[PDB]
Amino acid sequence: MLVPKRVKHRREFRGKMRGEAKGGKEVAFGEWGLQATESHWITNRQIEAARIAMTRYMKRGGKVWIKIFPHKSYTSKAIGVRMGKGKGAPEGWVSPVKRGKIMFEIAGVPEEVAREALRLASHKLPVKTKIVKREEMGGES
Amino acid sequence: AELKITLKRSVIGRPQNQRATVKALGLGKVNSTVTKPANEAIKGMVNTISHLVDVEEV
Amino acid sequence: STSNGRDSESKRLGAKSADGQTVTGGSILYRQRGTKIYPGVNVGIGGDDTLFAKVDGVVRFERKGRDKKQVSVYPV
RNA sequence: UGUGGUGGCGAUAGCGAGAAGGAUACACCUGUUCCCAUGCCGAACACAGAAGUUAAGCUUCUUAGCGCCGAUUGUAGUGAAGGGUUUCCCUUUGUGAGAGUAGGACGUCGCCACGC
RNA sequence: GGCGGUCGCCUCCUAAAAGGUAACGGAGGCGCCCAAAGGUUCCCUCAGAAUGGUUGGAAAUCAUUCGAAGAGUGUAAAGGCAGAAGGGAGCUUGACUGCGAGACCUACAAGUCGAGCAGGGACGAAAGUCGGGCUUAGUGAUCCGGUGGUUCCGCAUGGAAGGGCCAUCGCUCAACGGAUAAAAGCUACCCUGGGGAUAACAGGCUUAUCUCCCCCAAGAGUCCACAUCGACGGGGAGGUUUG
RNA sequence: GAUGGAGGUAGAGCACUGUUUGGACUAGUUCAGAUAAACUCCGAAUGCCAUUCAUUUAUAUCCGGGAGUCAGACUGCGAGUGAUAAGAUCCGUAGUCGAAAGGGAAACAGCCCAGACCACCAGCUAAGGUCCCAAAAUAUAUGUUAAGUGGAAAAGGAUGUGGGGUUGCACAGACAACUAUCGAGUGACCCUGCGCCGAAAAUGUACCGGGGCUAAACAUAUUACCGAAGCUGUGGACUACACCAUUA
């Protein structure tokens, strides 16, 4: 599980995703991408589950870029406790993802291994996805 | 020059500046009319009320 | 069972007369902390940074060089 | 015209690289007797000067590497008016960025003094 | 409801680009300090880094070159400040008396800023600046009592006793717009008036949790993912469980 | 409406402070990529303050007599608490209800249309509708769906069907089938309209209001009609103000 070292604030607000990605919508470092087409929260455990599945399938390695980091914490109260007093205790970490964001990148491996690995990563996740390659600019090798 | 302005909708359910605009023109009940000069101020009132009103350049 | 729960009274800071308004001597123009705005022709600063007229005239908010603002009062 | 001084204007006026110059003026430079000075030091500030020099400041001129001033049209948002599930999304009408760019730019306006 | 916490005042976020704005919402401070850390006149410019140098080390103290602020500002945070509000030196007590046109805030009572006039001054050659401190917390009506002043009154008259007016002192009255100078518990042994304005079963809404059903598939299964079981993860139905 | 202004939200940005991924490097700085409620080099729409301004309109201020209210509710929109649950709770902003009858939504405080002085066996429309219950089109042109989808529900699955694209292999003979010929086409990809499975609860069909529907469903256009206590027509009452000749 990824965790931020040293937060400045222990609790915070949650909202208000209102989808459209602000940042990385193109492949930057690899050859193949996994782009989210819905907007949702994505947690520590979902990322690690997807990463383990993606790497296990690629015997002889290759490389993998995780491009999504959980910055924002949770809180929650307990069963049997009435409404009222201040926020609960923090339990978890998440990152909000909006539609358009590329989330993983793979390279050093032909199509079918990369496509199978990105297929296995998506069943571990709560979003709809596409698979994209680097298309066309002044230079794309 | 002039414009005939007829009131086709009701003012129940609308906000207060739209009510007061209908009043500033002098429109009372549904289907009552009014005639005004063509200005940049009267056209602004007509543009605030356009969804309630019919206008004919006369 | 929380240890928060306290605040101070709001202070009603801001602009107290408008650009282009005529004003009599001594009337407040702007309440602030520190000089967000500066005093100009015929305007004074108080002890806690409030800006006031010294003379009757019109109020004009202007630009002080590259990154600062000024208030002046100009008699007719 | 050239130089000294003293002013307005958002650095489009700035920074760095490079050249040149002493006519008067500006400077560096030379000294501590006397006005004044160092929490030590005539370094500074203060004064008396006029051997020496354009090396440094200063002035003029070249340069768009760094800053600065930046449109247009496209998007993101959002006044009004409407539609689907209402977490969110869409269609008309009006407004319209921040980025990213085409371009600008190595100042401009004025008073006094002296010299040509 | 009890137990726990809180009760006045200051700064930020919430707060939807004027002002204002709730919650047992998210974070911190105050109940002072300074005779200079106040006034005024002159002068000054920071934190670091790199290079060398004996003790001396990463880092005490010296020298040079880069350095718009990455420092400092009595104390919390925000807004300000390098024409300093930051830092040194000389002289001083304006941390003055009587006031006050006009504004701000505001239910009231209170709170805040203020050019200018008069008396008498400090610093400076002048112009001038000075009615505490970069700004905003550091406080408590009235009644009653104490101390000092007074060209006020004084129950037939002259005094006195006593009172008034001006200046100041006595509050964790902290439940901080302050009930009285003075105040804790039990009732299953209980009584009256109200309330579904409010707690318990049943209903209703919700589905975290619970029971059930699934998607992907690493693996186990001698070999073989799917005879049987299904790690890390993902998606639903139901309204019997705890809420 | 025009003109000036104060202010840091929605964006989006990484100069400053937190949080963060890759690469080069070295002291023994760099190239890229993200992120924020208490970050900001930047920065709207709208709201707010003004004006010897303009055009329409009728209020505003000051003194005095008499009150009532200090339990609100739901529905857009934008925030916090909650699990971005509740017909939950607490604020901001607009409407209806409260204190509002009438039409639509089967029945329905708060949703959509619209504000009842009274009489009529007259007319035109709104929202919503036009096969029968039940007023008005068994309308017109061109398509889609076969599932009673329409008329509750997801991840995922599939030679269901419509439309638009990109291509591999084909009469110097293709894919399939037959041993050891055949005489037209045959595979693989993308976006997209509408459908299918996934789909189990307790008195009796049992979310189409019912009958029933293959259009009486859905999409795009077009014209008629129905439809309210809304508006109009004819007459009456009461009030105000202008007209008018006293007569009001």
Side-chain angles (χ1 to χ4, degrees):
Chain A
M1 308 181 39
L2 305 168
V3 183
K5 265 128 60 265
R6 190 180 313 260
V7 303
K8 162 140 58 180
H9 302 295
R10 224 206 272 93
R11 344 268 159 95
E12 46 186 279
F13 300 159
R14 320 156 209 246
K16 283 294 297 188
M17 281 182 275
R18 258 186 273 275
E20 181 69 36
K22 181 170 164 188
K25 284 124 103 212
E26 3 284 5
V27 169
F29 317 109
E31 301 166 279
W32 293 96
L34 211 246
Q35 183 198 45
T37 29
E38 288 181 321
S39 159
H40 211 280
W41 273 11
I42 293 171
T43 74
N44 270 340
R45 308 193 147 97
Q46 286 151 24
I47 302 171
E48 183 154 89
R51 204 241 332 147
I52 280 152
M54 208 160 41
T55 59
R56 193 191 291 117
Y57 196 83
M58 319 194 309
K59 24 176 172 70
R60 266 288 163 160
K63 217 180 312 170
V64 164
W65 287 268
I66 290 178
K67 287 177 58 76
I68 277 301
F69 192 91
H71 294 291
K72 155 170 288 166
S73 54
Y74 255 160
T75 55
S76 114
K77 279 161 163 174
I79 298 184
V81 194
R82 295 193 192 163
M83 304 287 293
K85 304 108 135 199
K87 302 213 48 155
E91 314 261 317
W93 297 93
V94 291
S95 83
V97 180
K98 313 215 271 187
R99 63 192 96 100
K101 190 124 203 156
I102 285 198
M103 290 125 90
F104 296 89
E105 276 162 7
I106 298 179
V109 141
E111 252 203 17
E112 305 212 346
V113 181
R115 286 179 117 97
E116 259 291 348
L118 290 179
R119 219 257 302 167
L120 303 200
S122 84
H123 293 282
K124 306 300 195 196
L125 293 182
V127 257
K128 302 255 206 57
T129 74
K130 278 197 169 57
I131 294 171
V132 192
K133 10 126 179 262
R134 278 227 190 78
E135 299 200 18
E136 172 171 45
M137 323 279 290
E140 289 176 1
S141 89
Chain B
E2 287 162 25
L3 313 164
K4 301 181 57 72
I5 307 150
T6 165
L7 211 220
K8 285 194 151 201
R9 312 293 311 270
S10 160
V11 282
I12 316 164
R14 312 304 188 167
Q16 279 216 343
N17 66 286
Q18 290 172 41
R19 284 182 182 256
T21 54
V22 154
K23 224 198 266 205
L25 293 162
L27 285 176
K29 308 203 266 58
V30 180
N31 292 323
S32 59
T33 54
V34 113
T35 52
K36 297 291 188 199
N39 293 332
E40 278 152 21
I42 280 163
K43 277 194 222 87
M45 311 208 235
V46 172
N47 274 324
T48 44
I49 312 178
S50 63
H51 56 292
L52 311 166
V53 130
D54 244 328
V55 168
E56 310 150 359
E57 285 80 14
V58 132
Chain C
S1 6
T2 133
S3 29
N4 308 312
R6 48 192 117 65
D7 229 311
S8 78
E9 286 165 36
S10 322
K11 251 74 214 200
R12 284 78 165 157
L13 294 168
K16 308 299 191 188
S17 66
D19 191 299
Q21 189 192 120
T22 22
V23 120
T24 59
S27 57
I28 307 196
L29 309 187
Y30 202 77
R31 297 260 207 197
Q32 50 186 168
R33 287 302 163 247
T35 44
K36 312 170 83 261
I37 304 191
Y38 273 90
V41 204
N42 297 293
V43 168
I45 8 166
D48 54 351
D49 290 291
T50 120
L51 304 168
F52 59 94
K54 306 169 147 180
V55 153
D56 313 31
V58 201
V59 181
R60 293 259 138 89
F61 278 97
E62 318 139 340
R63 183 188 86 249
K64 176 163 156 70
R66 180 173 261 243
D67 287 306
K68 295 267 48 191
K69 303 180 174 177
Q70 282 204 332
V71 229
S72 292
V73 171
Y74 290 110
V76 212

